[PDB]
């Protein structure tokens, strides 16, 4: 099922919930230890990891270097080693059972830095920095290469994407998206990098485009019904689900589903309550 961790509504949240696309109902599971929004989720060895973010609360706004592990049949969170630096609005991807933490912010600082986590060693190590400073960056893995997509450098919002080659440790710029997107939902379905929604500095977006590696081409597909940035995204059963987000007025509880065979979006559920900036992954 689809797990959503953290988020923001009036304050950063501790929620961990699981959506069942088969039966349509939500399961409520163990709270995060520390509230977090602007984090990312991923899955390694069936375990669910919560990376970076910040605790934005009535009492303080502390960027998080934390990494925490949830076990789906222990229902327990356990802390792992922390990152080199705090990363709010981080992006993460998984290659060869290792987690890559990309970009994000600490206070004023917008990172280009990138580090990698070793689950059987509980260690982080620096790797090559990005060409670009990026927060609200979407991250995807395709053919074991790591793609950093869009985001915000502190002054401009980005349509650029760059590719990380783990066996050469060098970042390379690729073809830019057709749309400037910070806080988009970025994932991989079929064999295309999808970028859904986001904020371009004027308006939240409902457009969606996808990157074909072999032709180095971004093409637009069917747009979502509801504009959103700071959304969660994952693919389940070969279909894209996007979760919550902010539309410039409202914290969304809408969950939309894209079927790639028909190129259509349809609303599948509403979250328990609207929230933005969640970490989403499936197990």
């Amino acid at each position: 099922l689809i797990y959503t961790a953290g988020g923001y509504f009036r304050q950063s949240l501790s929620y961990l919930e699981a959506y069942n696309p088969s039966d349509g109902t939500w399961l409520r599971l163990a709270d995060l230890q520390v509230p977090r929004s602007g984090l990312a989720g991923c899955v390694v060895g069936g375990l669910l990891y919560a990376v970076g973010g910040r605790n934005n609360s009535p009492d303080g706004n502390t960027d998080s270097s934390a990494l925490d592990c949830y076990n789906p049949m222990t229902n327990q969170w356990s802390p792992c080693a922390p990152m080199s630096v705090p990363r709010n609005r981080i992006g993460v991807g998984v290659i060869d059972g290792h987690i890559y933490a990309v970009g994000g912010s600490h206070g004023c600082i917008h990172h280009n830095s990138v580090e990698r986590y070793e689950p059987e060693r509980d260690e982080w190590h620096l790797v090559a920095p990005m060409l670009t400073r990026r927060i609200g960056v979407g991250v995807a893995v395709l053919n074991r290469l790591l793609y950093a997509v869009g985001g915000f450098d502190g002054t401009n919002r980005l349509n650029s994407a760059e590719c990380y080659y783990p066996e050469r440790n060098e970042w390379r710029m690729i073809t830019a998206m057709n749309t400037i997107r910070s806080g988009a939902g970025v994932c991989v379905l079929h064999n295309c990098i999808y970028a859904a929604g986001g904020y371009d500095g004027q308006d939240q977006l409902n457009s969606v485009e996808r990157y074909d590696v072999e032709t180095e081409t971004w093409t637009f597909v069917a747009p979502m019904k509801h504009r959103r940035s700071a959304l969660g995204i994952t693919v389940h059963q070969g279909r894209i689900y996007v979760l919550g987000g902010y539309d410039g007025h409202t914290f969304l509880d809408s969950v939309e589903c894209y079927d790639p065979d028909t190129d259509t979006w349809s609303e599948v559920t509403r979250m328990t309550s609207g929230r933005s900036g969640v970490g989403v992954a499936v197990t």
Binding site: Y8, G136, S229, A230, F251, S276, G277
Partner: peptide, 6 residues
């Protein structure tokens, strides 16, 4: 924040 709502 116009993008996350925070």
């Amino acid at each position: 924040d116009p993008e996350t709502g925070e």
